[PDB]
């Protein structure tokens, strides 16, 4: 009925199309168990959201780098910020780990006991941490626009858009890493080199991707 990752192949039993972006792609059966699939769903959503933020930031910084704005590349921004501003790298790492630890720990214990964070033990906030579904934490803090509490069809469509954009951003980040390790320049520099000559500037002519070329 619904389209799958491999046309003609029947979709697995653990993938019935209830989740967003369900194409029945699981040849290794890593998510056959329900709890394991739940954990992997939250992991994929977090991965896609982080990948989306990273892809947007990398694209914007490379845009500012191509134009005469002085923006450093994404593979040198850390050194530029730490050396330009008197910022201690271990101190920043510890602060980031503290904030991420608090947020991810609350999220983890909410995954173990759904709705437990809504008891009011954190400054009295209750409905802001009640949670809607697995990997979809609705509330006035995470969703102040209230898009998750109205027009169910639009919400499901946005869920499909979010999972697809997340997978695309993950592939984009992997492409950024491979492009930097193979060509040595930024993603927009590679795009300009390819647009200048697409027949001779690609992965088949970089001299690194195809060793027999």
């Amino acid at each position: 009925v619904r389209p799958v990752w491999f046309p003609g192949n029947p979709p697995p039993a653990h993938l019935d199309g209830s989740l967003a972006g369900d194409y029945g792609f699981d040849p290794l059966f890593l998510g056959q168990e329900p709890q394991t699939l739940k954990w992997y769903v939250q992991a994929e959503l977090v991965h896609g959201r982080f990948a989306m933020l990273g892809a947007a930031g990398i694209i914007l910084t490379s845009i500012g780098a191509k134009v005469g704005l002085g923006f450093p590349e994404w593979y040198d921004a850390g050194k530029v910020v730490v050396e330009k501003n008197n910022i201690d790298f271990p101190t920043l790492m510890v602060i980031q780990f503290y904030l991420m630890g608090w947020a991810e720990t609350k999220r983890w214990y909410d995954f173990k006991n759904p709705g437990s964070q809504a008891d009011g033990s954190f400054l009295g906030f209750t409905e802001e941490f009640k949670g809607l579904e697995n990997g979809y934490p609705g509330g006035r803090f995470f969703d102040p626009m209230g898009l998750s509490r109205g027009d169910a069809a639009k919400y499901q469509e946005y869920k499909q858009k979010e999972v697809k954009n997340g997978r695309l951003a993950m592939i984009a980040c992997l492409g950024f890493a491979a492009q930097y390790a193979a060509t040595g320049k930024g993603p927009l520099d590679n795009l300009a080199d390819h647009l200048a000559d697409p027949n001779h500037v690609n992965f088949a002519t970089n001299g690194v991707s195809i060793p027999i070329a």
Partner: protein
């Protein structure tokens, strides 16, 4: 019924009850009742602020053609210090915005005058105070409300255009209008820049990166200059 797209089906959450309802909501940000109630006040405040700002910029340039509006906060000297002016503005604006916010969350709760117990605002809606705030109302209430929201939307887009034209050309609204009327085929944004797969040219930002205001170097950058076409 007037709509933003003739022959189009308006969204289910828009039934043409609120003023200026033209069935335009592709993202569905107004589907929730509470979100729509808050955004209505936000849109009204934005409308009035933008109308006042556009009128101020126009009168400022017509009366004073030698003072740039973008530089209005820089080349204006007053006996009242900038810190004192900021403190006065922060306290007065904080007081009025607190009263408005309390009326939003709790209607009919701050309509009473604290100094004098005999003055009190009559019952009204949220976002439309009335009473002392509306001494003269010439015309129909609903008609004037629709006119207010339409003029506010136009003023909001006008202020955005004012900022962008002042950042791209460095001239005021009247100056930009005259320059555009002089050479319309070569002074539009399409004539100033174009993007192709082999080249990406954008107009330069006429606003300096830093402004020396009493030796502090206030950064004044062009809004998303890297994304400029």
């Amino acid at each position: 019924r007037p709509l933003w797209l003739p022959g189009s089906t308006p969204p289910a959450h828009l039934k043409g009850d609120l003023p200026g309802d033209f069935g335009f909501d592709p993202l569905g940000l107004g589907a929730n009742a509470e979100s729509l109630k808050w955004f209505k006040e936000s849109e009204l405040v934005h409308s009035r602020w933008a109308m006042a700002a556009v009128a101020g910029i126009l009168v400022q340039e017509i009366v004073r053609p030698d003072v740039f509006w973008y530089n209005a906060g820089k080349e204006v000297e007053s006996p009242l210090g900038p810190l004192g002016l900021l403190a006065v503005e922060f306290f007065l604006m904080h007081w009025v915005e607190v009263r408005r916010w309390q009326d939003l969350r709790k209607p009919g709760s701050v309509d009473q005058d604290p100094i004098f117990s005999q003055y009190k605002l009559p019952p009204h809606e949220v976002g439309y105070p009335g009473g002392v705030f509306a001494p003269f109302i010439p015309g129909d209430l609903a008609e004037l409300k629709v006119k207010e929201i339409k003029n506010g939307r136009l003023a909001m887009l006008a202020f955005v255009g004012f900022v962008m034209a002042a950042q791209v050309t460095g001239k005021g609204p009247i100056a930009a209008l005259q320059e555009h009327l002089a050479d319309p085929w070569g002074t539009t944004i399409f004539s100033k820049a174009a993007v192709v797969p082999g080249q990406a040219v954008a107009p330069p930002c006429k606003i300096p990166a830093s402004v020396s205001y009493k030796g502090i170097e206030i950064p004044t950058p062009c809004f998303l200059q890297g994304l400029w076409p």
